[PDB]
Every structure is written in C-alpha cells, then in structure tokens.
Design a protein around this nucleic acid. Structure first.
Ligand SMILES: [Zn+2]
Ligand SMILES: [Zn+2]
Length: 612
RNA sequence: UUACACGUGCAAAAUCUG
C-alpha cells in the first residue's frame, strides 16, 4: 500500500482500543518495505503504553533512532508517555530532558507520568517549572496536577490551581471539574466539592462517583446514599467503581436491605468478580449483622487482595469470632498475603472482644519483630481494650501512660468504659478527668461517671456529675435500638411510649415476661441506676430500648424469623440474660449489636459466652 | 497538524436519662 494507508489503519486501531492490531499492522507494514514516519510512531507507541509492553516500546524507540526522528516533538512526547505508562519514570525523564523542543503535551506527558506513579510532588515541581518557562497549560495539565493535589492533600495548592483553571477558561471541561470534586473532598472541603458538582454543566459517572465517595469517606453516608438514588433518577448507570463507596455508606448506616439491593445489581451487571465490590460486600454484610452472608461473599470471591482478607478478619472481629479471625490470619500468611497495619488492628480487636488475652499479647509483641509493621495508636488502643475487658485495669492505665503516643479521647474512654464494667470508682474518676481535659464537650465521660457512681450507690455524687453536665450545656445522644421491619427502620429509646403500636408492643412485653418468669428468669435491680424503689426498678429493666425493639419484631414478623437490632450502647448484664431467655422462648435467633460488637442469641445462649 | 486526562473498598473506645 502506501505509508498513508498503513498509518490510517494503525491510527484507527491505536485510538479505538485495539493496541495489538495496531502493532500487528506495524509489523506487516515494516515487513512490506514501507518506512514508518513521525505519523506512525506516536500511535504505535501509544499502543505500547496501552499494553504496558516495555520491550516493544524500546524496540520502536530503536526504530526512531535509526529513522532519524529524535527531534520530532510528536515522536518524543509519545516516547515520554510510553515509558511513563510502563513504570519507567527515569527513561521518560531522560527523553523529556533531551528534547530539543517541547510543547504543552510533552510537559503534560511527563507531569502525568509522575502523578500516575505515586509521584505527586515531582509532578507539582515540574508544573511550577512550567510557569517559569511561560508554557501555557491545557485542560490535561490542570487535570493532572489536580490529581497530584488530591493525593497530597494540599488544599492551598489546589485552591490556586482551581483559580488558575478559571482564569485559563477550563472550568467547563468535565475532566477538570471531576478533578476539582475529587481534590476538594480529599483535601477536607466537602462543601467546595459539592459547589463544583452542583455548578457543573456536564456530569459523567465519574462526577457522581467522586462526589459520593467524598461524602461516604467524610461520614455523610445518608447523603452519599441520596446522591446514589438521585444518580439513578437522572439515568446515570453506576460502573464497578460507584458501588464500593456506596456499599461503604450502607455499612455505616446498617442498611442491610439497601446493601442487599446493590448485591442484586452487582450480580446482574457482572461486577460480582471485582475485588473492591467483594471487599465492600463483606464489609457491608458484617457491619449490618450478617457474618454468614459476609463469609459467603469471601468464599465465592475469584480473587482477593489484602483488603478482602482484612475485611473478613474485621468481620469476624466485630462479631466476636476471635478464634475464626485468627485462623484467617494464618491462612493469609500461608496463601502469601502480607499483613498490613489494618490487619493487625483487626486481629487485636478480635482478641479483645473474644478474651484472647494470651494470643493478643503474642501478635502485638511480635508485630514489629517478625513483621515490618510498626505500632500505631490504634494497636495500643486495642491492647487497652483487651486488658480493660479482661479486668486488668492497672495494666490498661499503665499502658496508656507508657504509650509512645499522646493519649486521646478513645484510649481514655476505653479505660473509663472498662471501669464502668468492673466498678472501679477511683480509676473512673481519673479516667473521666483526663477525658474532660482532652474534650470538654463529650457527653460520654459524664454519663459514664454518673453510671459508675449510681452503680456504687453514690447517688448524691452521681447527681452532681449530672448537674455539672446540664450547667455546661453538654448534650448526650439518646441511647436507642432500631430494627428494620418491611424496609422501615424503627427507632426505640428506653421507656419509649411514643410508638404507634406501643400498646401492642407493651402487651407483648407483658406476655413475654410471663414466659420468662416460668423459664426461670429473675431480674436483678443492681443493674438499674435510678434511685427508685424496687417496684419501678424491675419495671425499668423491662422497657429498655432493645427489649422494645424485640417486642416489635416478633409482633410484626412471622414466628421464627431471625431478628436484627442495632443499638448505640452496650447491653447490660440482666438484659443480656433476658435476651438469652427470649431467644429460646420465641424460637428465633436474635442478633443485637452494641456500640460495635455483635451478639448472637440462639437456643438460650449467646455466641459471646457471657464475655463482651 | 498526530501524542498528553479525571473517580475505589479494609483501623481501636463510650451514652438504658434527649
Ligand atoms: Zn438493659
Ligand atoms: Zn452476648
């Protein structure tokens, strides 16, 4: 044929997404005796960068040398991109440094090469050199350096780039705007991200995903879910990257139903084999009270990274299956998956909630010797949690002081919560004091100390701690348990008499306590922390938040149906005993969550073995 | 005049009285 005919065929396949066809035609063209020129090399090199075929890229680079195209800006810039997309920033920089003449694209190719290979600062440094040479940026430049800002978190740098974008007339480019959304979220300004998102003239799925990820990562899970529904309302179809962030919001909200819907979408749309989708699925099921479904997703997973293992390890940890979490960590090492810091936080949390004191000390002490993992403040908080639940409050406080980190509200709150369980009034005062200096607005140290005093019979003291809370304007979030029945969650506080079906819920509670009394249940009043006679103390135990949520569940669901209840507070001992009696009385498996840990009541016992 | 583009999931604690 001709060089034009060969170039047009190669050009078509290189930009269409058929890099091997472009390279096969390159070989046939060379065998044919047709000499490729500067209109062949950029598209053939583009195909190499697409396939990351470094060996062929150097082969074509050799052809460029022999053909005498070393001074061509198009050929050299394609060489920069090829080496950069092949993970060879050194050779990409050597091409860039030796170009006798470059343009914006050659600068963009090198800057994108740095930013795309975990090299965000050398990208910004080259971008700053670009101003000193008076090179006008393009939409590609601003899109690439905004991705570097997002990775580094420099908001003031990105604020300057956003301004430069507007002054350069690129604010309506969908790529540039998508970068601004991701940058602003990753830099801590979710509001500036929403402003760019709202003012956008055109929004792809990347636009909706970057906004939703920014919300779910920032705690606003109700809003990421609302934008997911609004995205479907506008006819935008989520890809395989949208659902992981969406499922992470379902896990935070206990939206077991919602998360089930996404799983059906995942099956229908062929995303079932994606690691991110699988890791988000096991995390969703676990945080929603279904360790069984979480294990099923982990089993069927065709491929697993360290996050998929860490998610299932944290799944067992949160559900009190400490031993099972430790078997998984061993198969991780046998299957050649190195443990991260997130791995050790999860297995240490598993040992804490399951009482594996010996094993918890082993993995913690062996975390840095036998593994490159160095201790974060989260691993020490796990140890304070482990010792606190084992009753070793002296070792817990001594670890807090000797900690190579500055103590926080979590690590002292762990000790304070443990003092509540074991009745250490003195240590409770000390722990509550250190929390108030760290944060004076947290209502937890007040109610905790008020509960500690009231448990000790120090009513006058407890009244003053409650008095001091009301005068400092400290507001506490109501302890409540909710239960999803027919896609409608149902919130219940202790002694709640505001529910529509209150009289049938309470009559059910009366019928239940009748059977519980015959089964041998005797409520103790030492667990009631109110200075009230015995007649109302047993009545107060009867109407706790989860006891209302159970009573509503078994009057609105068929008999024998498993019930799930999510609370924001730890269950007391007598209510843990009462739910054990209820589990066999009603013939159901009742899954109740504390602040984080899950209980499983079945056939008259709980999976925690009365250790939580 | 070719070449250069953006979005990912897994981290320890506490509120039974709002
Ligand atoms: Zn209770
Ligand atoms: Zn239990």
């Amino acid at each position: 044929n001709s060089v034009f005919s060969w170039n047009s065929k190669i050009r078509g396949y290189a930009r269409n997404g058929q890099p091997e066809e472009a390279l096969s035609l390159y070989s046939q063209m060379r065998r044919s005796g047709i000499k490729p020129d500067n209109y062949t090399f950029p598209f053939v090199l583009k195909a190499c960068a697409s396939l990351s075929s470094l060996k062929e890229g150097k082969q074509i680079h050799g052809h460029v040398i022999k053909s005498g195209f070393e001074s061509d800006v198009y050929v050299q810039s394609a060489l920069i991109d090829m080496y950069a997309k092949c993970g060879e920033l050194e050779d990409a920089r050597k091409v860039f440094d030796e170009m006798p003449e470059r343009n914006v694209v050659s600068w963009n190719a090198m800057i994108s090469g740095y930013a795309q290979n975990g090299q965000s600062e050398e990208a910004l440094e080259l971008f700053r050199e670009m101003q000193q040479e008076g090179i006008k940026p393009s939409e590609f430049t601003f899109c690439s350096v905004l991705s570097a800002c997002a990775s580094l978190g420099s908001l003031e740098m990105g604020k300057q780039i956003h301004g430069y974008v507007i002054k350069s007339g690129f604010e309506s480019i969908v790529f540039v705007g998508n970068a601004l959304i991701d940058m602003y979220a990753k830099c801590g300004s979710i509001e500036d991200a929403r402003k760019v998102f709202d003012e956008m003239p055109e929004r792809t799925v990347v636009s909706w995903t970057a906004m939703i990820s920014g919300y779910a990562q920032n705690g606003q899970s109700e809003e990421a879910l609302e934008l997911f529904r609004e995205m479907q309302r506008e006819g935008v179809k989520p890809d395989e990257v949208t659902l992981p962030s969406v499922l992470s919001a379902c896990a935070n909200l206990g939206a077991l139903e919602q998360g089930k819907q996404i799983h059906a979408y995942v099956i229908k749309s062929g995303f079932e084999s994606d690691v991110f989708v699988g890791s988000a699925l096991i995390d969703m099921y676990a945080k929603c009270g279904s360790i069984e479904d979480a294990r099923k997703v982990f089993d069927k997973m065709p491929e697993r990274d360290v996050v998929s293992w860490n998610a299932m390890i944290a799944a067992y940890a949160q559900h009190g299956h400490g031993k099972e979490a430790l078997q998984l960590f061993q198969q991780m090492q046998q299957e050649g998956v190195k443990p991260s810091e997130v791995t050790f936080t999860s297995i240490l949390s598993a040992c804490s909630h399951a009482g594996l004191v010996d094993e918890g000390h082993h993995y913690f002490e062996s975390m840095s010797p036998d593994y490159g993992i160095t201790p974060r403040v989260e691993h020490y908080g796990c140890m304070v949690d482990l010792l606190g639940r084992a009753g070793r409050l002296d070792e817990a406080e001594d670890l807090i002081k000797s900690m190579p980190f500055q103590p926080n509200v979590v690590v002292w709150g762990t000790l304070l919560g443990a003092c509540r369980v074991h009745g250490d009034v003195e240590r409770g005062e000390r722990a509550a004091e250190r929390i108030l200096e760290l944060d004076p607005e947290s209502a937890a140290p007040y109610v905790l100390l008020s509960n500690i005093y009231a448990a000790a019979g120090r009513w006058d003291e407890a009244a003053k701690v409650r008095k001091l809370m009301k005068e400092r304007g400290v507001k506490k979030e109501p302890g409540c348990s909710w239960i999803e029945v027919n896609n409608k969650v149902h919130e219940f506080v202790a002694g709640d008499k505001s529910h529509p079906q209150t009289k049938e819920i309470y009559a059910e509670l009366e019928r239940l306590s009748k059977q519980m009394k015959e089964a041998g249940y005797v409520p103790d009043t030492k667990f009631v922390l109110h200075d009230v006679e015995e007649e109302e103390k047993e009545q107060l135990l009867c109407y706790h938040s989860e006891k209302l949520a159970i009573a509503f569940g078994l009057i609105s669901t068929p008999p024998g149906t498993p019930l799930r209840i999510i609370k924001n507070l730890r269950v007391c001992g007598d209510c843990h005993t009462a739910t054990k009696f209820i589990s066999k009385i009603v013939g159901r498996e009742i899954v109740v969550r504390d602040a984080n840990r899950f209980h499983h009541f079945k056939d008259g016992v709980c999976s925690c073995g009365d250790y939580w």
